Write a protein that binds this ligand. Structure first.
Ligand code: FMN
Ligand code: LDB
Length: 334
């Protein structure tokens, strides 16, 4: 099974809590995180893009770096880990994404890929006057279909004459083309989203589910595998979990409870047994060996090819993962 790190490009990472570690996302922190992940043979690092926050006491995701320039800087200080940036497709023309991807292909020596998202959060786009309207919910995947067709032409041949409802290319040129076949990843959960991924993505990100119910997402991965049969392409699922690990199960549970006890309800109001403290994320809470075991269970779910991990504390969570959890995982014996 592959393991990636979801890098905190947003302040406080994925915990919405006065008792959680408090930190701004800086280049240097993301650098320390990704270089530590790489030291422990993490397979990839991904940042999201988040153009508007949720406020409250912790000003949750009010402070966010931009994904392509962050990952270009991280590519320059790494040498093995795969690097993925997220394009919010409403905000960047496809030929710019195509040339940015070529550029980070160059920085990284072929280690770069792109996570394509339609955008769902209307205010992220409305705030800058670029929301298409409420037709967009229904048409997101049509737009994204034309978008990726333009990227495919440009990465494949260096040119595109594509013409659709949303784009008009007139002998559009992008060169250099990527040194390696450019990976596209998607995080579709809907039927349309999974059918998008089945056609154009290398893999699909889905949400892990429950607290300490590691195989609860299985039906989502089942649907994604069914979507992939429709195109004959091999598009596995990567599953997002938060790991809250410690020396014993009791100690990890005490941390989790402590985090939930500091919940920042004001920030939580703007947004809207799993907790909203981490956006109801799939959470694995346990001793190092309990977490290793639960992650081994994820690896056995049909369709599951990797996990994307957040931590309560990235610097020491990556360290304990690599020192205490990973060496116990069957799916990492390679
Ligand atoms: C791992 C992961 C990363 C995501 N990153 C982003 C992001 O950077 N920006 C964003 O607007 N949405 C992001 N999303 C939300 C999805 O792109 C998506 O809209 C949502 O999962 C619902 O699926 P649908 O688009 O099929 O309705 C992410 C989802 C997952 C699972
Ligand atoms: O659930 C989520 N995790 C990270 C980013 C976004 S937008 N949503």
């Amino acid at each position: 099974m592959k393991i990636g790190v979801f890098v905190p490009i947003g302040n406080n990472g994925w915990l919405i809590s006065t008792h959680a570690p408090q930190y701004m996302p800086t280049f240097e922190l993301n650098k320390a995180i990704v270089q530590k992940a790489e030291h422990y043979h993490f397979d990839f690092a991904l940042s999201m893009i988040k153009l508007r926050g949720f406020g409250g006491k912790t000003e949750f995701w009010d402070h966010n770096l931009e994904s392509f320039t962050l990952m270009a800087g991280l590519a320059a200080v790494t040498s093995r880990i795969q690097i993925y940036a997220t394009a919010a497709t409403l905000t960047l023309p496809p030929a710019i994404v195509a040339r940015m991807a070529a550029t980070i292909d160059s920085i990284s020596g072929g280690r770069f890929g792109v996570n394509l998202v339609t955008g769902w959060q209307k205010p992220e786009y409305e705030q800058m006057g670029i929301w298409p309207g409420d037709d967009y919910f229904s048409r997101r995947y049509d737009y994204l279909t034309e978008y990726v067709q333009v990227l495919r032409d440009l990465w494949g041949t260096g040119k595109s004459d594509f013409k659709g409802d949303f784009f008009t290319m007139n002998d559009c040129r992008v060169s250099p083309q990527p040194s390696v076949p450019m990976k596209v990843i998607c995080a579709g959960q809907s039927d349309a989203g999974m059918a998008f991924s089945a056609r154009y993505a290398d893999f699909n990100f889905c949400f892990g589910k429950g607290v300490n119910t590691p195989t609860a997402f299985a039906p989502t991965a089942a649907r994604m595998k069914q979507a992939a049969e429709q195109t004959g392409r091999d598009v596995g699922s990567y599953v997002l979990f938060m790991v809250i690990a410690d020396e014993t199960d009791d100690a990890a549970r005490a941390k989790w409870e402590h985090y939930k006890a500091g919940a920042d309800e004001e920030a939580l109001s703007w947004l809207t047994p799993t907790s909203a403290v981490n956006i109801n994320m799939g959470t694995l809470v346990g001793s190092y060996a309990s977490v290793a075991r639960m992650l081994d269970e994820v690896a056995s779910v049909p369709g599951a090819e990797g996990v994307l991990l957040t931590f309560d504390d990235f610097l020491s969570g990556i360290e304990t993962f690599g020192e205490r959890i990973q060496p116990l995982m069957q799916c990492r014996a390679h």
